[PDB]
Amino acid sequence: VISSKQQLASLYLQAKQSLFKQRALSATMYGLSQKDIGQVISSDMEFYSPENEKQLRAELLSISNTIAGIKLDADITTKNNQQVMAGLTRYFAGEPNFNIGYIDTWMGLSPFIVNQINGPLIDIPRVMQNDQPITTEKEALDYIVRLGQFDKLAATIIEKQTADAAQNWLPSKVTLQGAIKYLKGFTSGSAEQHPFVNVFREKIEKVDSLTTEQKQSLITQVIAKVSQVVYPAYQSVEKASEQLLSEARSESGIWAQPKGSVYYQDAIKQLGDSELSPTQIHQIGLDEVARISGVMNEILLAQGYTKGTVGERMVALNEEPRFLYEDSIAGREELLSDINGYITEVTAKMAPVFRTTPSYQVEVKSFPVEVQDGAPGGQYTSPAVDGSKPGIYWINLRDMKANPKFGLKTLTYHEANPGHHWQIALNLDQAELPFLRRIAPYNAYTEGWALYSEQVAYELGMYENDPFGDLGRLQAELFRAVRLVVDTGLHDKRWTREQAISYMSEQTGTAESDVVAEIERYMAWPGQALGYKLGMLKILSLREQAKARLGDKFDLAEFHDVVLLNGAVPMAVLSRNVNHWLDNK
């Protein structure tokens, strides 16, 4: 007789193994192998045909529904595993009435399989160049074998984009044009000088168990796949995408798709972790912009900056030499030293309220020169589960004007500690949880936590004697409030791209070219921008409930342990855990 607990564990395992077998590049990203997946995936490719996507989603939805129906005969953790794992399997199944798009192991259902910012043709090369080990002849051969399957990757991607277009689901012209530009850029240089080759050359050079001739032969093999398989595959998709441009819509938001409003309401649930209407979320955005702006005005006035909007004033500050690193090797070294100093200081000073140290140490890297033009200002990538590849805070050193000194502390807290690295690494350390719970990509939790972290860094005194850094923190908070306004603007209120750009520029003092990339991101990722503030507001609301309940018995360190040590979760589960803690005090 299989107990309910045993049936549930099998289901959670089945979810893990099935998702990752079909998302073998995500498996590589996390450093998973046959021990984790139940089969070797190290040279497997991902495929995206209509039938692939249908079967993947149907399996996960079946698992979700079976998990949800089981009667436990159990502690809060066992109950929470059921609820979280039913939710996560539904998140990766996607909205069951939409067969469009593709399932992303981070974002869940994602609407445009080919787009300008992510999707398999952007992310699979990134994983292969960054996360896939090349330390042995066998690992080199896995890289070659993967490259050789790019023809099928491309044909299945086109088949899915075509299926979606047959149902009148396709990207806006802007989104499609941005995808084309990427795809053209990918094959614009010679194959022999492609990053797939150059990365391979740099890694294979380090391998002492291969003779120089053996290394040369493998490099030739890589060049052959890139030239013969990769290049025509990308060209194929570029041409297909070009064919779709005339049908692509001029409208910017997801409302313009068939059933787009229903899609967006689902995105709000999955990525904002909210059941509020787009109207209510928009208004919360407007109120937060007013509130944060008003705070920043006061600080500005006190520094003698009394003319113009908050945004104008922040633009003016970004021009002053005291806020700009030199555009030189030494200036970039200064920036990197400053970052490293910020991490060291906060990690030490934060210990009284972050009393559990995760088993992974973060590292800082600059985006390579080849990718920095399209890359974000900063990003965090998770460690491999085993620690063999570190968590990394990536920083974009392309333009010093884009790295004003007053914005670096908040970015650094957000990406590293007490933000993404601290949270993600702690979640990975919860080895008693079902595996998908250890990497659960709850956007509102994950982004809301990191934005909350930025405020906690202030409450720990990281901006002592630093009013301009504090303004940088508040500017970053303001930016995320603007996100509530512009994402709901575009996708429900039918704001155009240009109206959203103008609003965001005017409200935040951010440079137009950065704003253009953000608004186009929001257009490709409806709802994703909502997680940051909705999650932060909920964490803070919970904290305020706890402080009211406990009074002078409130301990922020305990609150942090309840929020972090139970992993990334839906807000409803985070509230249940806070309440369990309050009830037992």
Side-chain-facing half-sphere of 101: CA atoms under 13 Å: 25
Contacts 24+ apart (CB under 8 A), 470-473: 470/299, 471/296, 471/299, 471/300, 471/314, 471/317, 471/406, 472/404, 472/406, 472/407, 472/408, 472/409, 472/410, 473/409, 473/410
In one-letter notation, the amino acid at residue 56 is L
Helix (H) or strand (E) holding 350: none
Helix axis angle for 467-491 and 512-524, nearest 10°, is: 40
For the record, the structure tokens of 221 come out as 């093999």
The resolution in angstroms reads: 1.7
Nearest to 500 by CA among 246, 285, 267, 268: 285
Q: What is the largest CA-CA distance in the chain?
A: 75
CB 412 within 8 A of CB 326: no
Report how far apart, in Å, the C-alpha atoms of 525 and of each of 98, 305, 326 are: 16, 36, 35
Strands (E), 79-126: 102-104, 108-110
For the record, the structure tokens of 510 come out as 């951010």
For the record, the structure tokens of 39 come out as 């089969």
Beta strands at 363-366 and 392-395: parallel, antiparallel or unpaired: parallel
Locate tokens 């006190």: which residue? 302
**CA 464, CA 176: separation in Å to the nearest integer?**
46
For the record, the structure tokens of 388 come out as 């063999």
Q: How was this structure determined?
A: X-ray
Contacts 24+ apart (CB under 8 A), 60-67: 60/15, 60/18, 60/19, 60/89, 60/90, 60/92, 60/93, 61/89, 61/90, 61/93, 61/96, 63/11, 63/14, 63/15, 63/18, 63/89, 64/89, 64/90, 64/93, 66/11, 67/8, 67/11, 67/12
Nearest to 288 by CA among 18, 543, 540: 540
Residue 145 DSSP SS3: helix
Write the DSSP string, 268-295. HHHHH---S-HHHHHHHHHHHHHHHHHH
Residue 168 DSSP SS3: coil
**CA 545, CA 415: separation in Å to the nearest integer?**
27
Q: What are phi and psi of 583, to 5 degrees?
A: -70, -25
CB 436 within 8 A of CB 569: no
CB atoms under 10 Å from CB of 548, counted, come to 10
**CA 495, CA 476: separation in Å to the nearest integer?**
23
Q: Which residues of 423-449 are buried (b: 16+ CB within 10 A; e: fewer)?
A: bbbbbbbeeebbbbbbbbbbbbbbbbb
**CA 204, CA 201: separation in Å to the nearest integer?**
5
Nearest to 159 by CA among 206, 224, 99: 99
**CA 126, CA 158: separation in Å to the nearest integer?**
20
The separation between CA 308 and the C-alpha centre of its own chain, rounded to angstroms, equals 35
CB 406 within 8 A of CB 52: no
How many residues would you count in the chain?
585
Domain interval for residue 500: 1-585
- Please, is 74 exposed, middle or buried when counting C-beta atoms within 10 Å of its C-beta (0-12, 13-18, 19+)? middle
- H helices within 307-438, ranges in order? 310-317, 329-349, 405-415, 420-429, 435-438
| Count of domains forming the chain | 1
